[PDB]
Design a binder for this molecule. Structure first.
Ligand SMILES: OC[C@H]1O[C@@H](O)[C@H](O)[C@@H](O)[C@H]1O
Ligand SMILES: OC[C@H]1O[C@H](O)[C@H](O)[C@@H](O)[C@@H]1O
Length: 803
């Protein structure tokens, strides 16, 4: 194989009481060290520590120094091959050693890096010792980073003359024009490294295959010299007749196979997946993909996977992005760092657009040990690494040079901005540059005069991202009629799943004794807005390309507004909780963003007889009729309204994007019947009063998973009454017992204020529910999960694994 999985047979230890500096030496004794496979996040395995140097910001989980070692032999069948050690990502400030010699140091925690080890390996089946020091001295992060080799590790094995790392660049110049003539013109730029000790003459064959693997185009380059130790550059054009475009509904990808030819002999082969798609940000019309106008329905996403921590997992990140697509999302912002290759694969396969963001700081640090201290020497390397990694990915539409960068008020920030945009454009000119900027917010009411340095930075990027700055959406468009504006960061409303507090009070950045936030879209940070208010400001403007809400998913750390308020340790900003369980606001976004008729009632229906409950319906239906125990409580209706250019939306005469009743509580069944303008029923939702807790009910999202050692089944554990209604406030401790061909990868409940372990075999329900994550091993067969709780009836589910 050209790329080998190098995840297995590692040893790990944290540096605690005594120095591990000796662990670089091959001879060091690691026989007592823990044995594990990568990927690995050592922080997520630890108990929460209220005294952690990570503070609340990093979720009260310790980092510090840790060491990985791997002792291995090289097969005879690899002599005279080029071998690189490839890390997808190590958080952070790592130093790698082979056979006691330093290969290098890599500061940045969120990029891949590679070391050529061809001339450093012992090839004779003698023992090689690889040592990685990971230095996450804290505080380094405004959110939960994780610590360690949290992404995949590979060997790349090639002949001395080979396609370079990221050695292909497949583009579709003027695709709109070509597509109107029933083709895609495909431009292919190929880099060939000659790592041999002698010049060669080289040709490149480029063959394009469709998803079925039928050849659809091919082209052979001219012959070119590649001197010893140099790169030859090739550029070839070809045509796909009647191309299949990559789109949100049809995320179709072709495969380029590159053959490296020396004297008619193939010495290397290399595959590149790519898609044919065009898009445009328009200063007056907003965004379009392949000529289809649309708003960016976007979310921000951090890199953690909840109970998995930072340790990457293809199924887990795919599940996150499936849930976002189900909310009606079409676009993601990789806040605030390059995403994993598993994340890229998910947006490519699911049909989601992606803004890739390089930096959370430039030179000026946000946290003592963040990247700021490395930026002036490493920025050019890290920004080009992001662009070079991703340039063939159809999902990526924009490169962000930074988020909320303090430097952008200084002449130093202007020179940096110009450098970053120039370095990006040396790698790729086919996607706009952007920035996420918060320092124009001002008083939140009046159009803010732009700082002169920020203004020159807004002229330097191709597309201007505003953070929390609704007061400028119109004024900046009128003052700067060639600007392409979108909301790079919006709302930051805070909410807890199944919590319905201060129903008629709209509070800014307010803490409560419950350590929760309300799901009546009525808690939000002082710089932010309600979900509704951030959306209305966007909805009403054609020129405004769309927005990226803070956030899609909850993440570990930043428990705002509970600053330094242990055990508040993870976020409230997500539409969906860390366990992948939707909050009520998930249904508000469905109601604004999706066409398929839906209706969603809140709150739950376990109250006290007589109490006037605030009842909301999130719906995209014209009207809803509410029923209590089969009797009508009244119709509520929207007006069918039109934006200033005639885009239709539903809103009440009072400006609300939701429907509302005040209901004197009576136990039983509350039902919402959603109807069109003609009174025809198009959707229904109900909530029932739950009785005493009686059972634990298990539901697997997938009952059949692959026996590959990494695939996952996500098991919901609910507390139900004797009729199987979920008990909306239940908090019972669930004890999980797994048997069979699997292990429990983690447990969670989405409770921001829990300091229960993620890496454990028990978890309290939170608002009725907990999660168990089951992982397969390499042997096929059966997994059984048993869930018990004191005084209730147990739950059981079987997972089947196929090989
Ligand atoms: O409101 C909280 C958020 O607001 C800002 C920033 O870009 C995000 O990283 C997060 O801190
Ligand atoms: O207090 C922290 C917050 O302060 C500022 O107002 C920023 O705009 C916001 O994004 C930041 O995280």
């Amino acid at each position: 194989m050209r790329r080998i999985n190098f995840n297995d047979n590692w040893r790990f230890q944290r540096e605690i009481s005594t120095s591990l500096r000796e662990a670089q030496k091959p001879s060091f004794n690691d026989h007592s060290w823990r044995q594990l496979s990568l990927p690995h996040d050592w922080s997520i395995e630890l108990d929460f520590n209220k005294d952690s140097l990570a503070t609340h910001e990093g979720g009260y989980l310790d980092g510090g120094v840790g060491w990985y070692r791997k002792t291995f032999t090289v097969p005879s069948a690899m002599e005279g091959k080029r071998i690189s050690l490839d890390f997808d990502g190590v958080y952070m400030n790592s130093t790698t050693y082979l056979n006691g010699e330093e290969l290098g140091t890599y500061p940045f925690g969120y990029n891949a890096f590679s070391y050529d080890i061809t001339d450093k390996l012992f090839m004779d089946g003698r023992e090689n010792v690889l040592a990685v020091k990971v230095d996450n001295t804290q505080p380094s992060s405004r959110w939960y980073s994780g610590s360690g080799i949290y992404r995949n590790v590979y060997l790349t094995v090639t002949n001395p003359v080979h396609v370079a790392r990221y050695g292909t660049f497949v583009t579709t110049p003027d695709l709109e024009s070509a597509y109107a003539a029933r083709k895609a013109e495909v431009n292919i730029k190929t880099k060939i490294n000659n790592d041999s000790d002698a010049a060669v003459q080289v040709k490149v064959k480029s063959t394009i295959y469709d998803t079925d693997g039928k050849e659809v185009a091919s082209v052979v380059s001219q012959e070119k010299t590649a001197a010893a130790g140099t790169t030859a550059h090739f550029e070839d054009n070809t045509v796909i007749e009647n191309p299949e475009l990559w789109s949100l509904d049809n995320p179709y990808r072709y495969k380029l196979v590159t053959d490296v030819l020396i004297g008619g002999e193939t010495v290397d082969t290399y595959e590149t997946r790519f898609g044919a798609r065009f898009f445009k940000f328009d200063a007056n019309e907003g965004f379009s993909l392949n000529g289809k106008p649309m708003k960016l329905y976007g979310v921000s996403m951090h890199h953690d996977l909840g109970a998995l921590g930072a340790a990457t997992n293809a199924r887990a990140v795919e599940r996150q992005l499936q849930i976002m697509k189900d909310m009606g999302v079409n676009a993601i912002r990789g806040t605030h760092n390059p995403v994993s290759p598993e994340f890229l694969e998910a947006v490519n396969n699911l049909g989601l657009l992606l803004i890739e963001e390089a930096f959370d700081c430039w030179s000026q640090s946000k946290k003592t040990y963040d990247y700021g201290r490395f930026f002036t020497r490493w920025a050019e390397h890290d920004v080009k690494e992001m662009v070079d990694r991703g340039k063939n990915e159809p999902s990526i539409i924009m490169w962000s040079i930074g988020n909320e960068i303090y430097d952008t008020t200084s002449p130093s920030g202007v020179e940096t901005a110009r450098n970053l945009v120039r370095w990006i454009k040396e790698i790729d000119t086919t996607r706009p540059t952007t920035i996420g900027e918060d320092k124009t917010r001002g008083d939140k009411v009046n159009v803010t005069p732009i700082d002169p340095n920020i203004l020159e930075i807004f002229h330097t990027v191709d597309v201007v991202g505003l953070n929390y700055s609704e007061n400028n959406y119109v004024g900046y468009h009128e003052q700067h009629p060639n600007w392409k504006l979108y909301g790079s960061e919006t709302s930051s409303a805070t909410r807890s799943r199944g919590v319905y507090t201060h129903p008629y009070e709209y509070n800014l950045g307010t803490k409560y004794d419950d350590l929760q936030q309300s799901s009546y879209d009525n808690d939000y940070v002082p710089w932010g807005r309600t979900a509704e208010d951030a959306w209305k400001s966007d909805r009403d403007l054609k020129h405004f390309a769309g927005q990226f809400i803070w956030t899609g998913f909850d993440y570990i750390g930043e428990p705002t507004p509970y600053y330094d308020s242990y055990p508040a340790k993870s976020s409230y900003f997500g539409a969906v909780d860390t366990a992948g369980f939707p909050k009520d606001i998930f249904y508000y976004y469905q109601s604004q963003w999706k066409k398929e008729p839906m209706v969603h009632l809140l709150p739950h229906w376990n109250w006290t007889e007589g109490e006037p409950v605030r009842v909301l319906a999130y719906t995209n239906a014209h009207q809803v009729e509410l029923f209590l125990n089969g009797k009508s409580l009244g119709v509520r209706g929207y007006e069918n309204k039109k934006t200033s250019w005639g885009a239709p939306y539903k809103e009440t005469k009072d400006g609300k994007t939701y429907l509302e009743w005040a209901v004197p509580f009576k136990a039983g069944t509350l039902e919402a019947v959603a109807m069109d303008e003609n009174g025809k029923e198009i959707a229904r939702d109900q909530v029932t009063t739950a009785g005493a807790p009686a059972a634990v009910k298990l539901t697997a999202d997938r009952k059949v998973i692959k026996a590959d050692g990494t695939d996952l089944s996500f098991i919901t554990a609910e507390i139900v009454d004797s009729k199987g209604n979920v008990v909306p406030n239940a908090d019972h401790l669930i004890q999980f017992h797994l048997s069979g061909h699997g292990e429990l990868a983690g447990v969670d409940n989405g409770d921001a204020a829990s300091v229960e372990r993620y890496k454990d075999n028990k978890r309290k329900a939170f608002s009725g529910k907990a999660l168990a994550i089951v992982q397969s091993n390499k042997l096929d067969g059966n997994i059984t999960l048993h869930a018990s709780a004191e005084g209730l009836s147990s739950g059981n589910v079987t997972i089947f694994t196929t090989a």
